[PDB]
Scaffold this active site. Structure first.
Site, PDB file in Angstrom:
ATOM      1  N   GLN A   1       0.717  -1.155  -0.204  1.00 13.91           N
ATOM      2  CA  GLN A   1       0.028  -0.042  -0.179  1.00 13.91           C
ATOM      3  C   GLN A   1       0.873   1.111  -0.103  1.00 13.91           C
TER       4      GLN A   1
ATOM      5  N   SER B   1       0.129   7.598   5.732  1.00 16.53           N
ATOM      6  CA  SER B   1      -1.272   7.864   6.309  1.00 16.53           C
ATOM      7  C   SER B   1      -2.101   8.275   5.386  1.00 16.53           C
TER       8      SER B   1
ATOM      9  N   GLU C   1      -0.557   0.605  10.359  1.00 19.49           N
ATOM     10  CA  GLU C   1      -1.899   0.750  10.460  1.00 19.49           C
ATOM     11  C   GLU C   1      -2.466   2.073  11.309  1.00 19.49           C
TER      12      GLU C   1
ATOM     13  N   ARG D   1      18.722  -7.096  41.649  1.00 23.31           N
ATOM     14  CA  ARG D   1      19.599  -6.077  41.714  1.00 23.31           C
ATOM     15  C   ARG D   1      19.379  -5.322  43.179  1.00 23.31           C
TER      16      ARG D   1
ATOM     17  N   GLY E   1      22.527   0.687  33.756  1.00 24.15           N
ATOM     18  CA  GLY E   1      23.473   0.579  32.755  1.00 24.15           C
ATOM     19  C   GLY E   1      23.419  -0.936  32.202  1.00 24.15           C
TER      20      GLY E   1
ATOM     21  N   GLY F   1       6.787  -5.206   3.975  1.00 24.82           N
ATOM     22  CA  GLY F   1       7.380  -6.446   4.277  1.00 24.82           C
ATOM     23  C   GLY F   1       7.165  -7.687   3.510  1.00 24.82           C
TER      24      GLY F   1
ATOM     25  N   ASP G   1      -0.804   6.185  12.096  1.00 24.09           N
ATOM     26  CA  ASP G   1      -0.264   6.957  12.832  1.00 24.09           C
ATOM     27  C   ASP G   1      -0.790   7.154  14.192  1.00 24.09           C
TER      28      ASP G   1
HETATM   29  C1  LIG Z   1       8.192  -1.575  10.233  1.00 23.41           C
HETATM   30  C2  LIG Z   1       7.182  -0.973   9.247  1.00 23.41           C
HETATM   31  C3  LIG Z   1       6.490  -1.854   8.463  1.00 23.41           C
HETATM   32  C4  LIG Z   1       5.512  -1.391   7.399  1.00 23.41           C
HETATM   33  N1  LIG Z   1       5.074  -2.382   6.637  1.00 23.41           N
HETATM   34  C5  LIG Z   1       3.982  -1.968   5.757  1.00 23.41           C
HETATM   35  C6  LIG Z   1       3.349  -3.083   4.941  1.00 23.41           C
HETATM   36  O1  LIG Z   1       3.800  -4.136   5.129  1.00 23.41           O
HETATM   37  N2  LIG Z   1       2.549  -2.594   3.832  1.00 23.41           N
HETATM   38  C7  LIG Z   1       2.337  -1.166   3.790  1.00 23.41           C
HETATM   39  O2  LIG Z   1       1.432  -0.998   2.786  1.00 23.41           O
HETATM   40  N3  LIG Z   1       2.791  -0.450   4.587  1.00 23.41           N
HETATM   41  C8  LIG Z   1       3.773  -0.786   5.486  1.00 23.41           C
HETATM   42  N4  LIG Z   1       4.351   0.347   6.361  1.00 23.41           N
HETATM   43  C9  LIG Z   1       3.935   1.629   6.024  1.00 23.41           C
HETATM   44  C10 LIG Z   1       3.026   1.809   7.306  1.00 23.41           C
HETATM   45  O3  LIG Z   1       2.069   0.885   7.441  1.00 23.41           O
HETATM   46  C11 LIG Z   1       2.325   3.347   7.550  1.00 23.41           C
HETATM   47  O4  LIG Z   1       1.307   3.416   6.678  1.00 23.41           O
HETATM   48  C12 LIG Z   1       3.208   4.381   7.516  1.00 23.41           C
HETATM   49  O5  LIG Z   1       4.468   4.358   8.165  1.00 23.41           O
HETATM   50  C13 LIG Z   1       2.346   5.812   7.704  1.00 23.41           C
HETATM   51  O6  LIG Z   1       3.431   6.744   8.439  1.00 23.41           O
HETATM   52  P1  LIG Z   1       4.032   7.791   7.341  1.00 23.41           P
HETATM   53  O7  LIG Z   1       5.497   7.255   7.215  1.00 23.41           O
HETATM   54  O8  LIG Z   1       2.974   8.117   6.199  1.00 23.41           O
HETATM   55  O9  LIG Z   1       4.001   9.182   8.382  1.00 23.41           O
HETATM   56  P2  LIG Z   1       3.225  10.354   7.759  1.00 23.41           P
HETATM   57  O10 LIG Z   1       1.668  10.406   7.718  1.00 23.41           O
HETATM   58  O11 LIG Z   1       3.869  11.068   6.702  1.00 23.41           O
HETATM   59  O12 LIG Z   1       3.502  11.138   9.215  1.00 23.41           O
HETATM   60  C14 LIG Z   1       4.629  11.832   9.257  1.00 23.41           C
HETATM   61  C15 LIG Z   1       4.305  12.728  10.447  1.00 23.41           C
HETATM   62  O13 LIG Z   1       3.301  13.696  10.139  1.00 23.41           O
HETATM   63  C16 LIG Z   1       2.246  13.575  10.989  1.00 23.41           C
HETATM   64  N5  LIG Z   1       0.826  13.782  10.303  1.00 23.41           N
HETATM   65  C17 LIG Z   1       0.613  13.312   9.202  1.00 23.41           C
HETATM   66  N6  LIG Z   1      -0.562  13.659   8.925  1.00 23.41           N
HETATM   67  C18 LIG Z   1      -1.204  14.558   9.912  1.00 23.41           C
HETATM   68  C19 LIG Z   1      -2.194  15.018  10.161  1.00 23.41           C
HETATM   69  N7  LIG Z   1      -3.340  14.932   9.157  1.00 23.41           N
HETATM   70  N8  LIG Z   1      -2.692  15.677  11.339  1.00 23.41           N
HETATM   71  C20 LIG Z   1      -1.566  15.811  12.360  1.00 23.41           C
HETATM   72  N9  LIG Z   1      -0.211  15.206  12.097  1.00 23.41           N
HETATM   73  C21 LIG Z   1      -0.179  14.676  10.792  1.00 23.41           C
HETATM   74  C22 LIG Z   1       2.200  12.573  11.675  1.00 23.41           C
HETATM   75  O14 LIG Z   1       1.703  12.434  13.026  1.00 23.41           O
HETATM   76  C23 LIG Z   1       3.975  12.019  11.709  1.00 23.41           C
HETATM   77  O15 LIG Z   1       4.173  12.852  12.742  1.00 23.41           O
HETATM   78  C24 LIG Z   1       5.266  -0.011   7.241  1.00 23.41           C
HETATM   79  C25 LIG Z   1       6.184   0.969   7.980  1.00 23.41           C
HETATM   80  C26 LIG Z   1       7.024   0.511   9.020  1.00 23.41           C
HETATM   81  C27 LIG Z   1       7.503   1.473   9.969  1.00 23.41           C
HETATM   82  C1  LIG Z   2      27.510   3.396  27.754  1.00 22.25           C
HETATM   83  C2  LIG Z   2      27.909   3.355  29.189  1.00 22.25           C
HETATM   84  C3  LIG Z   2      29.254   3.738  29.224  1.00 22.25           C
HETATM   85  C4  LIG Z   2      29.762   3.830  30.651  1.00 22.25           C
HETATM   86  N1  LIG Z   2      31.284   4.014  30.786  1.00 22.25           N
HETATM   87  C5  LIG Z   2      31.742   3.884  32.058  1.00 22.25           C
HETATM   88  C6  LIG Z   2      33.277   4.338  32.275  1.00 22.25           C
HETATM   89  O1  LIG Z   2      33.838   4.585  31.317  1.00 22.25           O
HETATM   90  N2  LIG Z   2      33.659   4.193  33.451  1.00 22.25           N
HETATM   91  C7  LIG Z   2      32.776   3.745  34.561  1.00 22.25           C
HETATM   92  O2  LIG Z   2      33.136   3.427  35.587  1.00 22.25           O
HETATM   93  N3  LIG Z   2      31.548   3.357  34.432  1.00 22.25           N
HETATM   94  C8  LIG Z   2      31.236   3.478  32.955  1.00 22.25           C
HETATM   95  N4  LIG Z   2      29.741   3.139  32.862  1.00 22.25           N
HETATM   96  C9  LIG Z   2      29.003   2.797  34.197  1.00 22.25           C
HETATM   97  C10 LIG Z   2      27.903   3.961  34.355  1.00 22.25           C
HETATM   98  O3  LIG Z   2      28.736   5.129  34.610  1.00 22.25           O
HETATM   99  C11 LIG Z   2      27.101   4.023  35.412  1.00 22.25           C
HETATM  100  O4  LIG Z   2      27.967   4.111  36.690  1.00 22.25           O
HETATM  101  C12 LIG Z   2      26.132   2.802  35.814  1.00 22.25           C
HETATM  102  O5  LIG Z   2      25.503   3.030  34.430  1.00 22.25           O
HETATM  103  C13 LIG Z   2      25.310   3.029  36.928  1.00 22.25           C
HETATM  104  O6  LIG Z   2      24.044   2.088  36.479  1.00 22.25           O
HETATM  105  P1  LIG Z   2      23.552   1.045  37.558  1.00 22.25           P
HETATM  106  O7  LIG Z   2      23.408  -0.136  36.401  1.00 22.25           O
HETATM  107  O8  LIG Z   2      24.339   0.949  38.675  1.00 22.25           O
HETATM  108  O9  LIG Z   2      22.302   1.751  37.942  1.00 22.25           O
HETATM  109  P2  LIG Z   2      21.783   1.260  39.491  1.00 22.25           P
HETATM  110  O10 LIG Z   2      22.195   2.182  40.484  1.00 22.25           O
HETATM  111  O11 LIG Z   2      22.012  -0.045  39.600  1.00 22.25           O
HETATM  112  O12 LIG Z   2      20.115   1.513  39.184  1.00 22.25           O
HETATM  113  C14 LIG Z   2      19.403   0.508  38.779  1.00 22.25           C
HETATM  114  C15 LIG Z   2      17.873   0.863  38.884  1.00 22.25           C
HETATM  115  O13 LIG Z   2      17.624   1.159  40.417  1.00 22.25           O
HETATM  116  C16 LIG Z   2      17.298   2.590  40.708  1.00 22.25           C
HETATM  117  N5  LIG Z   2      17.877   2.935  41.986  1.00 22.25           N
HETATM  118  C17 LIG Z   2      19.169   2.620  42.176  1.00 22.25           C
HETATM  119  N6  LIG Z   2      19.570   3.022  43.567  1.00 22.25           N
HETATM  120  C18 LIG Z   2      18.309   3.865  43.985  1.00 22.25           C
HETATM  121  C19 LIG Z   2      17.968   4.379  45.027  1.00 22.25           C
HETATM  122  N7  LIG Z   2      18.965   4.555  45.932  1.00 22.25           N
HETATM  123  N8  LIG Z   2      16.846   4.709  45.207  1.00 22.25           N
HETATM  124  C20 LIG Z   2      15.692   4.614  44.176  1.00 22.25           C
HETATM  125  N9  LIG Z   2      15.980   3.993  42.964  1.00 22.25           N
HETATM  126  C21 LIG Z   2      17.339   3.642  43.012  1.00 22.25           C
HETATM  127  C22 LIG Z   2      17.716   3.272  39.506  1.00 22.25           C
HETATM  128  O14 LIG Z   2      17.289   4.634  39.317  1.00 22.25           O
HETATM  129  C23 LIG Z   2      17.708   2.247  38.576  1.00 22.25           C
HETATM  130  O15 LIG Z   2      16.203   2.422  38.149  1.00 22.25           O
HETATM  131  C24 LIG Z   2      29.187   3.251  31.860  1.00 22.25           C
HETATM  132  C25 LIG Z   2      27.833   2.886  31.455  1.00 22.25           C
HETATM  133  C26 LIG Z   2      27.268   2.994  30.194  1.00 22.25           C
HETATM  134  C27 LIG Z   2      25.686   2.725  30.255  1.00 22.25           C
END
Ligand SMILES: Cc1cc2nc3c(=O)[nH]c(=O)nc-3n(C[C@H](O)[C@H](O)[C@H](O)COP(=O)(O)OP(=O)(O)OC[C@H]3O[C@@H](n4cnc5c(N)ncnc54)[C@H](O)[C@@H]3O)c2cc1C
Ligand SMILES: Cc1cc2nc3c(=O)[nH]c(=O)nc-3n(C[C@H](O)[C@H](O)[C@H](O)COP(=O)(O)OP(=O)(O)OC[C@H]3O[C@@H](n4cnc5c(N)ncnc54)[C@H](O)[C@@H]3O)c2cc1C
Lengths: 656, 654
Positions: free
Chosen positions: B135, B142, B422, B308, B399, B175, B424
């Site tokens: 389609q 849309s 199907e 955790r 993390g 697809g 937006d």
């Molecule tokens: C993973 C994937 C698989 C898909 N598979 C299929 C498939 O198998 N077969 C097929 O036929 N199609 C398929 N599609 C197309 C899909 O079904 C949608 O129809 C299409 O993605 C609709 O979005 P758009 O790209 O047209 O967004 P658009 O309508 O161009 O919207 C872009 C932006 O404009 C805004 N907007 C557009 N109109 C308005 C309005 N009137 N008022 C306010 N805001 C508006 C929207 O909210 C959105 O923010 C696929 C899409 C995806 C992402």
């Molecule tokens: C891309 C990436 C790069 C990184 N690079 C580095 C690096 O170079 N060097 C390094 O040292 N580290 C690195 N880190 C580790 C990172 O810096 C953080 O320290 C790590 O993501 C901390 O996350 P966590 O898993 O311990 O979160 P957690 O603290 O375990 O949190 C887990 C969940 O529990 C909640 N939670 C935890 N404590 C509380 C509380 N007291 N009260 C309420 N909620 C709580 C959190 O909100 C969260 O929802 C990296 C991490 C990422 C994702």
């Protein structure tokens, strides 16, 4: 090549060249961004072509290549370290160099003695060593005080022994550690004199300098794929475990705390508060990057929205560009507004950094809690808004936004760890809460609050005022909006402190009231953003219609927020319904005026196509033919028959 | 062989086996899900090991083989249609078979004459052809009425000529199109007898059955890489372009509209209203899939939140499981309530489908615009909430959630297109708004409204009533919450409508108030959810503590939404601050009750580890040693020196 957005550009009612300067921050900044930008962009060796389809191994080899090539341009062009930061920004690929410059050097600087820095920094500056920052462990991320890695002083031999007592004490996450790094600062619990003196930094060599093989007792590797094609997969995030690895004593960072020849903890003058200076710097830097990602995403959805038409044909007419719709406006323009807001709260932190370290030099500590809370809250606020904003921009691009070549998928994958590093967003906002709660309870003592909580010194008033808005336009006058945010926050924090004080045990009460504490902390942060935006508007700011547009952006950010959290202000009583509606009507008005300028205002970020890597956000708006030409390069398109098809599908078609 | 989550399991205050039944929908539903899932899960040929790291050529190959192996078991095990859909769900891998079964068959079925379904469906049923549904175009998604692909009848040859006039008319997204499909239902503008008759579907062969090469005129391929490692990249979304491809007259689906030999247009005289197939069933299906995805995420994040620990050591003790934290709770539990809520609406939607196809087959079209908006609004609501909860679930894992092998990154990337296909989400919610505005502006007549808008038969009352909650527990009573949501929706709509009648032309006014309308639409939809939940609780629900657990989740859902949109309850005057807070205190209390059951509640989804593909979410809670063993399987760990190193980094060092 036509510019399919030349008509949208014409409609601008301000000077873009000056807006460019405002975004950049200064003329110096812009000059430097612009020249390093274009110099990254127009160099074959920094191409991102193909990056998203590389298997991890070639992706990584390819990162190394670019990492080397960039170092080589830094040298050959004699760029300063500031310039080199820029240069790496525009190469735009996560890699170890980010941690070496970004964390490994700053840790030595901040925490090594005079002597230690003289020895290690020249090495790191010329990259005769490559260092990362190993703090997080499998079992501890946020709770640093609970790390399990140990560093045990050995008086018989003047060494520390670094040991990973358990699987979960394994280091995990630190970028650059997987494969590239030769050394790390390793955080571990210092054990000396049969006592635990808490977490410290140790400079531990991880691999031989001759052959890059891991030293005895060290186990190191990469942790696995992360979210998204490319994204952080070019970064070698590491797991690291130690088996009694032996290090010399002067490899402990001893600025604040040291260990004598004989064991025994000692403390220097040079205050442990000196380090709070580096909190501010890092957080600032992260807020800066939030404005950077938000601006990249906003720039793509905006250009795509001006080009995308859908519906609204009227007789034979062209369909309506989706940017003309008020729902597209309601999801998009607040994100634009937010990029300028976070840009400015970004500059204000630059100042806050100079202020804090001015005070740090007078042994002035009266301002530090507030500085800490202010930065924690702002990092949290802006990194959620931004992560949420980039997904929204993808969604706004409709189906095409789902395609890697749109730029948004990577930009979200790469961005999102911001919400967890250098502090979990929600954990930082409970810190903000505690500080507000603290600030309220010190009022009884007669202690008058300052900086960003100076408003809490005016609660008697803020508890009992009412907005006095009579027309939508009044929501334009700064004193109205500012007071409205002040009231809301005061009221919300007061309501917390009252609720909280019914618990005999205060720790019990923080636990139970957590969700609301965070809601209060958010409100306060929102207030900091709005009030700094207003402060910014009192500066001069040259260029025709520039300020005027920035005012429009101010209103939008604060009125978008006011509507989203509308209950906050109606609760308390501060505004009435009519008044809430008047704010709603003024945001609608503001969208209509922003409209003509959206494309020019994202043109002000000055990004190249190379940097943006979005077919949907190409400067010239030539989107569809580019998407078509782009599909014909995916691996599957190499022939009209996919590998697999004759083996599996053909038989079944005919049945076998 | 040790379950690190036993202490949490033992804390259950209800019969998990009977909650399983509830979740699945009936013992028959349950016995069926359970048997087909263990089947898939315990068969090496459906393994998902290594997928995520495959290059795309190989991922695709491996898709094609799974697909074929799937068809071989559907056949060898004499599986029915319903079991086959099940089987394909637990293979958990977007593939062409999903459009062939999901969209190509149902379109022919739906839009074809009986004569046509007799030559095509048998062919497609034995997969003697492989169809997709084409389609969407580069330039039109849309807006279906503006596709540019045309279909001109040639009287001089009894054929339609399907042509792609412009680059942006190119079919784009379907697809199964890009590499696998041999045919498509292609939607095009019917040009015949000199007049343009709007969109219609045409059966078109894309590729030679003997050798799979495209037929003269046809241009097809894949569109490229999509968000996320693996995820939908195992699906060949296509681009298809036509140079006047030729096609017999009986390949137009001639059910509703016909074309005669001599050209010219006749209509069947059999109401195009029959297409509820096209809506209620399909949207039913997306709503069901929303609960399916929400529940997977919430399942990984609940288990991980109970394993955790972080902070809370008091004297050198164990740290607190993060699941004890009020912030974790407040981010996680409404998501868990939503899965149950969206599960129950989905049931209610089956009812609606059966109610509508009873009526349509009969003589009654009156219930139809309601069925249309109702389902539109729910697709929008449940998919938006679900895509959000999934990202939120990843954030809940800290993390560790950033690693592919947490299961969450993929789950997000593969689910999120739901927000766009199907319909937006915002476009769909602009349609609820029209229907609501219609439903008001019609009230002055006499003919009171029905279904999910009968609450507007009582605007006068709901325009003036006000809450009488005098304490927290009062918000438990079903009547208070329902009235809370009906008052809210009624008010917002009335306000939109009042605001709109102020315009000379309604279109300008609609353009202008669009955000307020969507905002009102979401409110109508929340009401539907909440009220189907309530009705669900009028039913017999067997098993100790099942119904109470469900009551708790129902409250959670309604009051979480209540707090989040509290402006809407406060501003219209419905409640006072105190009542507002009372709603907030009750939600706390609810979190605290849900706490000990959180892990058993997600056990009731009865997912295998294979389906769930998450180390963080392992049934047995053995997270960290498993992460640690996963790391060594990454290709970068295949030696100690990375390719790159000596060539680029060694010279930099020395
Ligand atoms: C993973 C994937 C698989 C898909 N598979 C299929 C498939 O198998 N077969 C097929 O036929 N199609 C398929 N599609 C197309 C899909 O079904 C949608 O129809 C299409 O993605 C609709 O979005 P758009 O790209 O047209 O967004 P658009 O309508 O161009 O919207 C872009 C932006 O404009 C805004 N907007 C557009 N109109 C308005 C309005 N009137 N008022 C306010 N805001 C508006 C929207 O909210 C959105 O923010 C696929 C899409 C995806 C992402
Ligand atoms: C891309 C990436 C790069 C990184 N690079 C580095 C690096 O170079 N060097 C390094 O040292 N580290 C690195 N880190 C580790 C990172 O810096 C953080 O320290 C790590 O993501 C901390 O996350 P966590 O898993 O311990 O979160 P957690 O603290 O375990 O949190 C887990 C969940 O529990 C909640 N939670 C935890 N404590 C509380 C509380 N007291 N009260 C309420 N909620 C709580 C959190 O909100 C969260 O929802 C990296 C991490 C990422 C994702």
């Amino acid at each position: 090549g036509v510019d399919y957005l030349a008509d949208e550009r014409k409609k601008a009612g301000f000077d873009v060249d000056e807006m460019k300067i405002v975004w950049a921050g200064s003329r110096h900044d812009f000059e430097l961004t612009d020249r390093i930008s274009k110099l990254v962009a127009s160099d074959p060796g920094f191409s991102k072509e193909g990056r998203t389809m590389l298997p991890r191994k070639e992706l990584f080899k390819n990162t190394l290549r670019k990492a080397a090539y960039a170092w080589k341009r830094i040298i050959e062009l004699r760029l300063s370290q500031e310039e080199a930061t820029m240069l790496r920004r525009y190469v735009d690929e996560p890699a170890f160099t980010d941690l070496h410059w970004g964390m490994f050097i700053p840790a030595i600087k901040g925490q090594g003695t005079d002597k230690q820095q003289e020895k290690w920094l020249p090495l790191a500056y010329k990259m005769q060593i490559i260092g990362c920052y190993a703090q997080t462990e499998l079992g501890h991320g946020s709770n640093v005080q609970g790390l399990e890695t140990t560093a045990t002083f050995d008086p018989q031999t003047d060494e520390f022994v670094i040991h990973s007592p358990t699987l979960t004490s394994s280091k995990w996450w630190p970028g650059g550690l997987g494969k590239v790094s030769t050394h790390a600062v390793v955080y571990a619990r210092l054990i000396t004199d049969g006592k635990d003196y808490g977490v410290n930094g140790f400079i531990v060599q991880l691999r031989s300098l001759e052959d890059h093989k891991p030293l005895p007792g060290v186990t190191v590797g990469d942790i696995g794929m992360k979210f998204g094609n490319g994204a952080y997969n070019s970064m070698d995030n590491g797991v690291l475990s130690f088996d009694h690895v032996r290090i010399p004593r002067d490899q402990m960072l001893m600025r604040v705390s040291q260990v004598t020849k004989e064991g025994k903890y000692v403390q220097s003058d040079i205050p442990r508060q000196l380090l709070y200076g580096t909190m501010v710097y890092v957080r600032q830097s992260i807020v800066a990057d939030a404005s950077l990602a938000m601006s990249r995403a906003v720039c793509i959805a905006t250009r795509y929205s001006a080009v995308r038409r859908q519906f609204g044909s009227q007789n034979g007419g062209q369909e309506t560009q989706v940017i003309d719709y008020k729902t597209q406006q309601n999801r998009l323009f607040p994100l634009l507004a937010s990029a300028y807001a976070f840009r400015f709260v970004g500059e204000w932190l630059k100042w806050l950094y100079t202020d804090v370290t001015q005070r740090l030099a007078a042994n002035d500590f009266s301002t530090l809690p507030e500085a800490h809370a202010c930065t924690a809250g702002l990092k949290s606020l802006t990194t959620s808004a931004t992560a949420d904003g980039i997904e929204e921009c993808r969604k706004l691009c409709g189906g095409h936004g789902y395609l890697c070549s749109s730029g948004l998928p990577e930009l979200f994958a790469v961005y999102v760890p911001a919400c967890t590093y250098e502090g979990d967003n929600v954990v930082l906002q409970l810190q903000v809460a505690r500080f507000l709660m603290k600030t309220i309870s010190q009022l009884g003592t007669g202690k008058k609050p300052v900086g960003t909580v100076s408003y809490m010194g005016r609660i008697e008033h803020l508890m009992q005022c009412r907005s006095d808005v009579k027309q939508a336009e009044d929501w334009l006058k700064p004193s109205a909006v500012l007071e409205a945010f002040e009231a809301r926050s005061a009221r919300m924090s007061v309501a917390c402190a009252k609720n909280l004080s019914k618990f005999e045990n205060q720790e019990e009460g923080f636990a139970e009231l957590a969700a609301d504490l965070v809601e209060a902390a958010v409100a306060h942060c929102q207030l900091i953003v709005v009030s700094k935006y207003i402060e910014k508007l009192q500066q001069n700011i040259p260029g025709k219609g520039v300020k005027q547009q920035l005012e429009v952006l101010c209103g939008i950010y604060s009125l978008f927020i006011l509507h989203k959290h509308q209950g906050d202000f109606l609760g308390t009583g501060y505004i009435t319904s009519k008044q809430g509606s008047l704010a709603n009507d003024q945001l609608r008005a503001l969208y209509s005026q922003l409209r003509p300028n959206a494309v020019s205002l994202v043109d002000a970020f000055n990004y190249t196509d190379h940097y943006l890597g979005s077919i949907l956000g190409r400067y010239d708006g030539n989107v569809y033919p580019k998407l078509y030409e782009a599909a014909w390069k995916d691996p599957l398109n190499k022939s009209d028959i996919a590998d697999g098809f004759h083996e599996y599908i053909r038989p079944l078609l005919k049945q076998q």
